[PDB]
Structure formats: structure tokens, C-alpha cells
Design a protein around this nucleic acid. Sequence first.
RNA 1: CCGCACAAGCGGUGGAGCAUGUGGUUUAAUUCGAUGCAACGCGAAGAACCUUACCUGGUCUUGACAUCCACGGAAGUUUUCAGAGAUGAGAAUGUGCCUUCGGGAACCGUGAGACAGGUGCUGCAUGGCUGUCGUCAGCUCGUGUUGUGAAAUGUUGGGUUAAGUCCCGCAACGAGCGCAACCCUUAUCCUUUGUUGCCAGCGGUCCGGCCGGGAACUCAAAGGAGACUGCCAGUGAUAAACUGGAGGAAGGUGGGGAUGACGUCAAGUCAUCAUGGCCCUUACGACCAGGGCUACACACGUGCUACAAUGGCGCAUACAAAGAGAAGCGACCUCGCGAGAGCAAGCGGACCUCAUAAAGUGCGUCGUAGUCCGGAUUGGAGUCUGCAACUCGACUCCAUGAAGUCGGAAUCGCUAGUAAUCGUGGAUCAGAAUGCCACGGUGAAUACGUUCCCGG
Lengths: 99, 114, 224, 211, 127, 82, 100, 146
Amino acid sequence: QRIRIRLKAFDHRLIDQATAEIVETAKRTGAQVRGPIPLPTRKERFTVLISPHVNKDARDQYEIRTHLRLVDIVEPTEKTVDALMRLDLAAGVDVQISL
Amino acid sequence: ARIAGINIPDHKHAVIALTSIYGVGKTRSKAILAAAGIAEDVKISELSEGQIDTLRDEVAKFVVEGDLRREISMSIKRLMDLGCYRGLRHRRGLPVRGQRTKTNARTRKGPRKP
Amino acid sequence: VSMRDMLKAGVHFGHQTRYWNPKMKPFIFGARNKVHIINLEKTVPMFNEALAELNKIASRKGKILFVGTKRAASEAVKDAALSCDQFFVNHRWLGGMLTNWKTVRQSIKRLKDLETQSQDGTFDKLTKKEALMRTRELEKLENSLGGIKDMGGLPDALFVIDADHEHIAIKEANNLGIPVFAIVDTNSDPDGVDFVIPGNDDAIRAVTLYLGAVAATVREGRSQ
Amino acid sequence: GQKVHPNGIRLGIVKPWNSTWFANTKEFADNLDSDFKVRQYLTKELAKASVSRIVIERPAKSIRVTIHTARPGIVIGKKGEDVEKLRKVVADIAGVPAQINIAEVRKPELDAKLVADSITSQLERRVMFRRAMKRAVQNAMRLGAKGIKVEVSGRLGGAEIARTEWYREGRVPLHTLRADIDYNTSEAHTTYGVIGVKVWIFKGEILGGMA
Amino acid sequence: NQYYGTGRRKSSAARVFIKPGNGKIVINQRSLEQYFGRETARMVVRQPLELVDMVEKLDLYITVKGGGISGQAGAIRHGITRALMEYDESLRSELRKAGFVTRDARQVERKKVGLRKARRRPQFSKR
Amino acid sequence: PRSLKKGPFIDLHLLKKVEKAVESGDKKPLRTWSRRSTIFPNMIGLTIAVHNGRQHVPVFVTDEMVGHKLGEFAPTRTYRGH
Amino acid sequence: AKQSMKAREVKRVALADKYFAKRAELKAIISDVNASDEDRWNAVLKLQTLPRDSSPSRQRNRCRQTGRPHGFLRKFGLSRIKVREAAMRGEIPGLKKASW
Amino acid sequence: PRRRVIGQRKILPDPKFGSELLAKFVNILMVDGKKSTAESIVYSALETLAQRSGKSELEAFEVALENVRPTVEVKSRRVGGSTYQVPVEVRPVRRNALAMRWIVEAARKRGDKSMALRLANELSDAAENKGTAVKKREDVHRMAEA
RNA sequence: CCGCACAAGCGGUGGAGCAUGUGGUUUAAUUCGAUGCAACGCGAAGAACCUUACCUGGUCUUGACAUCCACGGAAGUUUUCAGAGAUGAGAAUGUGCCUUCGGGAACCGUGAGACAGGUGCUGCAUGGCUGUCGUCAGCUCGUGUUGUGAAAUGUUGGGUUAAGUCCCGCAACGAGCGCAACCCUUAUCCUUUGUUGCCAGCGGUCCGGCCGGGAACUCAAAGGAGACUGCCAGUGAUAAACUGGAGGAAGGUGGGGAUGACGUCAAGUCAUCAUGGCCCUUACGACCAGGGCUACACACGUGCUACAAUGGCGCAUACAAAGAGAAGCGACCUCGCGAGAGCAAGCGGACCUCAUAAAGUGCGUCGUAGUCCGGAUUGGAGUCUGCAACUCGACUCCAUGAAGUCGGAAUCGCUAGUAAUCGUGGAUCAGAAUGCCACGGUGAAUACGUUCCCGG
Ligand SMILES: [Mg+2]
Ligand SMILES: [Mg+2]
Ligand SMILES: [Mg+2]
Ligand SMILES: [Mg+2]
Ligand SMILES: [Mg+2]
Ligand SMILES: [Mg+2]
Ligand SMILES: [Mg+2]
Ligand SMILES: [Mg+2]
Ligand SMILES: [Mg+2]
Ligand SMILES: [Mg+2]
Ligand SMILES: [Mg+2]
Ligand SMILES: [Zn+2]
């Protein structure tokens, strides 16, 4: 009875336009939205030997931060499920719909 | 008192005193005491023959002192006599379990030379 | 200005007899109490003939630069320039202020850019500490070029107080051919002043007399 | 000393990525591998079409690429024919339905890729590197940059020594993270060998985040 | 009634709810003196109340997360103080000059590369 | 030691050659590369050459050798002091 | 490195793939308790008959661009260098310098 | 401190007996940030001082420390051409610190089956102004004026 | 005038044992590079096979890899023999698809040479990358001025700053590269949203946040808000600045990052790659097996563990952060002394799991000893990974218990949440951490200062 929507992207700005679009669609069909809920973003560190060959003193550190949002609607109607399936997003984002 | 072994245990706790006997470590020493059902901090003194007999028994169940030394010496000996690789090493007094002979093997190698 | 008008203000006053310049002998009435006394008989007609030239320049749309860097008389000279819609230098005369005109124009542009930017916005985009620093830079550019932001080009006439103190300015002017009008105390070298006014340059009262008379005649020249 | 790569540092600040697809650790490496390969191939193809940028965004059921160049009609031919065969070859080098898009650039002198490659080409004409890069920076500045800096390195003028050099003009703040510095590197293969060229163009500071 | 103060320390976070009436104090449904196996902690948690002296006047149901014991105690003292304040605000001056409304921020430093620790350097043989 | 649930280890072609030698009466010291094989009891009172890395050395097998691997009897290094 | 090495690893992968199920069931039988321990015996024998390339241990991760085994990043499948390349240019999506 | 002089951060007093000089002393005895196991021994020594040497153990501390806290110091430096063992004076905090150091090490000098025994009995001897810490104060005054 | 430069501090190194590198030595081979600062737990974030370039041997010659040409076969699947395998030798089955039927595509096999191939040489032919001075405070420019000019000024003086930082002086003025700031993160608050997170007040509850229920808080993460010498006083040109005070979560560039101007060093790398030139080509190319890269009279760095009663040991018991996870993490349960095994839930993960932090604390215990210290070494027996643990894995069990009792000359590291200690995680990775990169627990001492040391 829950329609749960996990969004995973790389920048918060995009994931947020995504959540905004989602909730405004939910309010097209007037679905019962729980809002965008911010989940703990995930951090990926990578230390690498930038210096080529023997030099090891030089080192660099890069990061990948996966931003993660959660939305849900407790009251699905048709106008919910169809339209939410009629939803396009920027390729930067990722959707997971569970029912 | 006598534990049927060449060495004589000291008047310290029984598990430690049994550990002193060759071929009897902490595990085996406490296990012999558990078989005898004897308390721990009792030492070699303050314990009658009525226990020393039992102890000499339950340790006679094991091999200790010279007899164990003969068994280990023969296992190292024949292993040398097989002409096996580790036999070679034991003949040369070098580490037999794969350590650096390039450096810091003195524990087996001994002192240092030019 | 009449000789009586000057004398009450003290225009006749001068520097010590210990400190005078050789070319000033014709303009010196004499000495009293080891003090050089300036002769108003020369001072008044020369000032009037200079006022004639200043009126002429301002009556042909001239741009006038009032120059004085005395810490006492800075505000007097600034207000004097404001009273006749002209341009001024009331703090340290930067070397090459006129000869290096291009750099001053770039500095004028930065002054204008900062004030325009604050009105336009984007100060909120800047950090509050940065926005305060930008305001301090605008204040610094105002304390440096408040008088000449609107001069537009090189001035048509210069008025100088204590020509010896401002000697770099007169050297520049002569190098540009821009005329120099200057109050010249006995210790100054009068070669650089094409219309030379020998008179006290420190006393606030006589300085204000010079400035007020010049500004009245400049407004008169503008009015036509 | 060794600077830091100016493009990478401003990523997200004022520099968007060149690849926007999201993925997971499962399909990550192969995904970027496909992207690399299609980049490489497209470069090879448009080697004369003056491509400045190739951005690749991968939707779940499709792959979409956008070319920043200045020679669109060159890439288009008639009715997007070569474009469509490109769509084919990239769809299959990606194994996924393709979507070719082209967003030409207007001021070719005002990128960092096109100018650098132009410099390399003229170096292959053995044009005087000096006057070549001079032309470059004149054109850029005259066009409206806030600063330009070129730099060339290695066995210049076919010399038997690697007397490198650099030329600068305008204003190039290389520590102000607020500033866009289009920086691109390229190479040139002389008979005498390989010579490197780096180009920075500072086009004013960005106010207001990534927007 | 119900007065709440939030205390943070190097790694621990506190949730302090006070009610006017006693001096009993409970932490994670344990009792302080037994909760902390070191007396200095009991001290440093009594500090605020021990100072304003309204100890057995209002009792405490505090909560704590993360960090070691000292972090707990610090977060506790801070929370306590920030509750006292929100409860009277006459003791603002008092607690501040007592060094309690500080919000200590001394935290551990990340390990930096080329260093055996955050700031320790490898034993380089200059010779 | 590898394990016991998997029992010992030995190449199959070792089994081939060894049982051929067995059934066929004594043979030549047979050539072998697999030091990693395990000595089996049936293979006793015979000999076998094993490639130490640069040549196959001979070793006359006997019972007590069982359990050890063929490699121990081919010292792949040469040393007599500094 | 040498194209010989790259193709070598490639062939190792392609090989060890096709025998996946066989190795699987064989190791199953072997490890399996209660087996005849004869069927286990000839089972492991049959196992070793397979090509030595079938073992996953032979497979060594290599950069897909420069054929370099060392400094491999399982997340990107590149060397410890070309990663920096595709990073500073901005091809690795969402990647950037880390200074926490 | 080539540009500006900074010292140790200001400390907070030990709450157990209100004294920060206690707190400083224990931070001198504190090994490897192990406060608890350290303050244990100082408390164990002061409590037994408080009986075997009259009451007021907080005051037994100084009746020993005054007996140890040196007055003259030797600060060698080449402001005169080479190393010069010059006798000078220090502010009270420095001699306090030196006294605390000298007793805590004198404690480590003895063992006696437990640290409590060492520290307690040696602080007693220092209260008596005889022993090693007081004695190495006598010696530092001896070499200096020599 | 600066700098953990010294001083003042603490804790080491140098002594032992081991780990690890390097050199020497040896080797059939111990592949290559890296060489004072600024090479020596360095390339390598992980050599049993593999990797691997080395040796020994067995082999192949348009070739392992690529295009092109022919010519023939679907592709494959299944299997046998010989070999150590490469490999040959076969034996079966399949012989599929587009085709406008001519063919193609598809692969594979033979030939054909063009050719492919090289971890071959030259980092003094190069690119690219990096170290180093050094996050050192500098670097210069337009213009102006002075000079016939080479130039100089700015940029110097007084100050002051972490700083060419800033004021003042100043024929200079300005700019630009630097510095600073914009960025990340941490310290306060508010706003928004509250599930898998949360529980103040709520009713039930088995009393477990568990759960109808609460949205406050803790958190979570997006937005904001905040610190500016802003305020006070005192100093100093009154200036800059400085000292103190207030207030404040924070105070004087809050904390930590990232960020490296010119240029230096024919610095380093032709074995990541790219590339000039040269050199090999039935071989310096290619394949397989085994061996080596792990060798020991040695020397040297780097580290680890220790020499003990602030201790060791038994029992009991509390508090973390940061992570990772699907040929994966793997619970629970059962078996096993244990390493583990079996069984098998769960989880692509605020949920499931790795996983119960250790020091701490409580009690007992040990009595100063080569010890209930220390644990190397050797025996024995197991386990697990993996074709495969002999050379040469990790680990468990039993037994064994060296040297070591704080280490000369000398030398190193650090100004606080640091040092020092205590554990946790990750990368690489089938497996293989005292190394590396992270996270937290606890948590010091000293700084009169600039005489010297050393560098600037
Ligand atoms: Mg592997
Ligand atoms: Mg080299
Ligand atoms: Mg080489
Ligand atoms: Mg060189
Ligand atoms: Mg071999
Ligand atoms: Mg090696
Ligand atoms: Mg070391
Ligand atoms: Mg112990
Ligand atoms: Mg001892
Ligand atoms: Mg290391
Ligand atoms: Mg820590
Ligand atoms: Zn005058």
C-alpha cells in the first residue's frame, strides 16, 4: 500500500529537482506524499599514487558522494501510478520504486 | 612432592608448578589438576601424598622430561636422515619455516660474524 | 581682493629670514622680527591679473584643479572646489598624477565600478567579510580620487597652495604646458608658476581668502 | 612547481562533469569504459570537425551524447547521414540505443580545445610557434577574454633541446575557485618528436554557485 | 515543568530533560554513580548543579550517545548548563564565566598522508 | 598441510607412471616435473628424478619418505658459504 | 604492457569462463562430506585434468587502457594513473578532489 | 616561541580535592593518557600520608614540596662565548614543576612491590626533607654555587 | 628576521627478537628501476602457480595480438590417446543465421606477404607526470618619472603583519601573477522534511522502542544565520597595527584541509602510457613446465614486539566513530578445544551482515624472579584458501620458552585534542598486513627566549 521511491544521484541539486518533480506529480494526482526525506549520503574515498614510477611521496584523495533521497505515498491511486510511471529525469539520477 | 620427573616443582600455585615440568604446559597442567579435582592456588606443599600419587599417575598418562626429549630429538634426527630439505636446514642450524636468512635470523643462527 | 582685505587676513606674513629662496627678493617688502614680510603692492595686482585669466579659462568651459595637501587646509581646498563645481586634490599629490593620466583613468574606472557594483547588487553573493572589504576598497578609492573622478580629462588650469610643497605637481604641469596658479611663500621657487601669487600659504584665514575669491570669480566666469 | 589540474579542481564548483550518467559499482567500470571508447572513436571521426567537447549521459534504456564543436554542417553532411551512421556505430559500441546530439560552439577562439588543437596543427605546418600562439592570444583577447595563457614544450622549432616556453596575457587567476578557466591540453607529433601545448582562458568569475 | 538542553562534546551528544523537584539523576535508565566507573566523571557532571547549588531541587533524566566516557561527561555538563540557562537565564553570566557555555570544539585531527598519525612524522634518519 | 577431507594430492600421470613401473617390474629412475606430488606408500624401494628447476635430480624412495612432497628432495638452490 | 600479456589475460578469462560450471560441481563433490571418498578421489583427479587457466587465481586484474596489473582500482578498472586523467578532465561522474 | 611565547594550556583543578596543583601533579604522573590508573596511585599515597604523617594530606604535599622545590637553577647558554653553567632564579611555577618532576621520578626509583608504596613513602621522606628528591635539590644548589 | 632551528619539553632510534627494504655476497637465475637532503614498509593498493620482464628446458615462425588477401569449413558441442604441459594425434555430434541464392554475415582452419611484435637503447632527444627548494613571500608589468643611454624608480624609508599584510613616509601611480579570500570539513542556531532514523509527553505492552501512537528532541541533509577588530578601553602618527575587556557556541586569517607564484635540480620516470632516434627480428618476438624473484659470512635504513607489578592473569562489566558487502557479506542453530564445519535467515542495505571495540571498570590473583616477564625458535597435530601451500600462505591446538632485566657514540618526533597510548575499518586481494590509507577511545608535558645549532 506504500509506494516507496528511493532516489540516488551524485549532486544534491539534481536529486532535489527530482524530489520536487515527484511530489508535485503526487499532488497532481493529489497522492499522500511524505515529502523528500534526506537519507545519509554515502562517501567514497580513494587515495592514489599520482607520482609515476618510484616516487611515492606524492598522493591524491578523491571522493564520490552518493546523495540519497526517500519519498513515499501511502495512498496510491491510478493517477498516482500511471503519471509516476510517466516521469522522466536527468540521467544523473536513479529511481527505485517499490510497492 | 616428587612428580615422577627429574625436575622438582617450586612451592608456587599448582598449575604454575606443573608447567615447570618439561612437556607439561599451562593447558596440560590445569587439565591434570582438573582430572585430580584439586583446587588451584594450593602449592606443592600443604598437599599430602594422597594427592601427589594421583598427580604422578595422571601425568604418567603423559610423556615428560627425558622420554619426550628423546622423542623430539629422534623426530628431528630422522628428519635430517631422510635427506629432506628441512632435514638439511636442521643440519645447518637455520630457520626451517621460511624466514629471512638475509637478515635477523640470529635466534636460530646465533651471534654475528664479519 | 583689496590690500586692506588681504592685510587684515595676514597675507603679508611670511617665513623666517633664515629660510628664503633667492628669486623671491623682488616680492619681499622687508623683514621684521627675523620674519620675511611679503609686499601686498605686488601681491594684489598679480592676484587680480590671475583672477582675470582664471575667469577667462572658466568662461571657456575650463576644468580647474585646486591643489593643496596641507593637513590643515585640505577640507578648505576641497570645499573651495565644490563651491565652483571643479576638481581638486586635497591629499598627497601622487607622482605622475597628470603625466601618468592613463593609470589615473584606470583607477577612476575601478572607483566607478565598485560604487556601481554595490548599487547593482551581488554584494549578497560575496561573503559578508568580502562585501565589507569591497566597501573599504571603495572608501580607499574615494579618499584617493574623490576630487578627480569626474575630471574626465586633463585639467585646463591649476591652482596650487604652497607651491614649494607641491613641487611635483608644478613640474608635471610645466611638462604638459598646463598653466600654474599658485600662492607662493617667500621660501618657494617662483619659476614654475606662470601667474605667481606671492603670499602666505599656511595661515587658514589667508588661504580661505584666496580660495573664496578665486571661487567667486570662477562662478562669475561660468555664469556669463 | 607542479600546479594542480585546473579543470578538475573546479568540478561541481563552476565546472560541470563531462559525463553525467549515474551507475552502481556493478556496472560502473564497464560503463565508463564504453564511454571512454566512444569518446575516442568520435574524436577520431570528427578529427577535422573541430570538436571541443563530448558529453555522455546514459539513461537506463538509452545512451545520449552531445558534441560541442564549431563545424556542425561538417558533422551533418546531408540530412544527418554521417551523423546517423555515427549514431549506429556508437549505439553498437555501447550496445545500447544511441542518441547523437550536437551543440556547436560560437566563439571557437574562445574555447580551450579548439585553440590548442589549432596551435598543434599549425605546429605541424612547422609554422613559427611564436607567431602561432601570438595569433592565438590576440584573437582570444580581441574576442573578449579576460585573460589567456598558452604554453608549449619540448624540442621547439625542431631544436635538439627541450627549451619549453609559455606566453601570457590579460588576467588568469589560478587560485580563485570562483573563476572559469577553460583549460585544455593537446599534443603535436613533429618529426623531431612530441611537443605539448597547454591553454588557459579566463573568462571572468562566476557568481552564484554552479547555476 | 519540562526544560531541555542539548550538550555536544568531542564525539558524544546529550539529551537533558529536567523537572523541578529533586536531585536524582538517571542516564539511559541507569544511575550516575553506578553508571560511571570513575568518580571524576561524577564530579564533572555535578559541576553545573554543584555550582548553582540548586542540586536537590529538580531531577534529571539525561540521555547520551557515542564517544567515550569523557565525551559523555562533557556532553552531559554542557546539556545541563544549557537547560539551566533556558530555565532561569539569570545564571547565564554565572555559567559563562564559570566556563560552561563554551561548547568545547577540540576534536580529533584526521590522519594526514605521509604521517604516521595526524601530526606525527616518520623517524627520518637525517644521517 | 592441505586438509584431510580432500585427502592427499598427486598428479594423475604420476599415478600412471608409478603404477606402470609397479606392474612392469623395476624401471629406470623415471623423470618428473611435479615436485608438488605426494609420496605414496606403494612407491617404495624405487627411485625417481624430479626437475629442480634446471634439471631432474634422482632420489631413491623409501617408506618414511611417504607424506612428504617430492619437492623436499630436490633443493632448488645452491650454496656452500661466502 | 606487451600486447602478448593483454591477450594472455583475455584468453585466461575467456577460458576460465567456459569451465565455470564444471569447476563448480567438481569442487562441490570434492568438498562434499559423505561422498564415497573414492568418487571424491577420482573427482579431484578429473578436476586437475582441466586447463590450469580455469582457476580464477590465474586471472590478474589489468588496466583496460594500458595493460597495467599494479595500482588497479576495482571500482573503475583502471591503473592508478589513468584514473587521475579521466578524473581531472571530468569523465568519472561525480568524482572530485577530496579534502575533508 | 621565536615570534611569541606560548606556554602550557590553562588547566582545571582536580575535583576530587579541589586542587589544580593536584591536577598538575597527576598530569605529570599520567602515563600515556591513562588518568584513572594514575590518579589512583596519587590518591592512594595522599590518603596514607594523611594518617602516617599527620592530617591534611593536601598540605603534606607542600610540606614535602617546599622541601624539594629548588631555588637556584642552571641555564647554560653561549651569551658569553660558550656553554656557561650560570646560576639564576626562576618564577615559582618552574620550581614547583621541577619539584613535582623530581618526586615523581624518585618514586620510579624504588619499586617496593607497588607504586602506592613508592610514592607515599618517598613523599614522606620529602616531607622529612631527606631522601633523593630533596637530595637532588641540595645537589643542584651545590653544583650551581660551586 | 624567520623555522620543533635551538632552548624548554615529553616520547623514541641506536642494545635484543622479529617484520621489511637496501647494499654486499651467492646463484643457473636471484628480472628491472629508484641512490645524500629530496633512494632504502620506495615503483608494488599486496611474487605459492599466475603475476614475471629471470634462469633451466621443452617448443612455434605473417606469428599470442592487427588489417588486407586468398582457399576451405557453420559456429560450436562431446570425447579419446600421447606428453609435464605446451602440444600433437584423433573419434564423435552439430553444420546454425541474412540472402534480391549470386553470396554474405558469422566465426574457425591453411596459405600469402605486406607485416604484426619488443618490459630492446637513449628521461641528456621528448611529451606527459612527479619530487625538491617552499605554501618560501615573492615575482614582475604597463604607464610615469630620471638619465644621451646601458638603466633606475615603483619594489626603497618608517612602521606593522603569517605574508610585497597594511598604514605612513616616499616620483611615482597602478595593475597582474602570487598572499588573502571564494572551496571542503569541523565547532552554534534556525528553517525544511521525519523512514529503515527518533521517543519528550502519549494508551497498551511480553517491558524489548515494541507499538497503536507522537514530530518535539536526538539524528539525517538541504537550506540558511553567525565573527567583522564589529564593541569597549588602553597603546602607537592619532596611522597601520597592538594589548586587554565585553559580549558571544565561536575573537582576532575559529579548527583542519584542499590550493604550490616565478624558477631551481640535463632531479625521477623511454618497465603505465605517448613519443624522436637507434636495435632485434625462425628472435632481444611467441608458448609451456618447473625454478627464481623469499638465497646468507654480511653490512644499512624503516618497523614491530618486548625487557614487566601504572604490571601479567582469571572472572565479571561500560562506553565509539568510521566503513564495507551479491562468483558478496553472511546471522540464527547445530557440531567442533580452537582455527572452523554443517545448516541456513537476512540483506545491492539509516533496516541485514561483517561486529560484542580495546584501553576502562569491578573482584581475585601473582611478589620482583629472567618471573604467571618476554615470547623467538623448534616439535607435534590440525584447519582454510586454492589445480596446487616442498622450495614458499595465513591460521588453530598441544608441547617447547631463546635473546631481552630500558640499550654507547649519536640521532629522531612533536606546541593540544597534539604528543603518547588503545583499538576499529578500508584499499590491494582466491588466499596471504608489524606496510599503507583512514576512524575513534583515552589523553599529557614544555616553552626564559633567540645565544647558539641548522635552514631560510
Ligand atoms: Mg590474484
Ligand atoms: Mg633511474
Ligand atoms: Mg630501465
Ligand atoms: Mg638526467
Ligand atoms: Mg621455473
Ligand atoms: Mg624482493
Ligand atoms: Mg626499521
Ligand atoms: Mg599475561
Ligand atoms: Mg624487571
Ligand atoms: Mg608503511
Ligand atoms: Mg585515535
Ligand atoms: Zn609657506
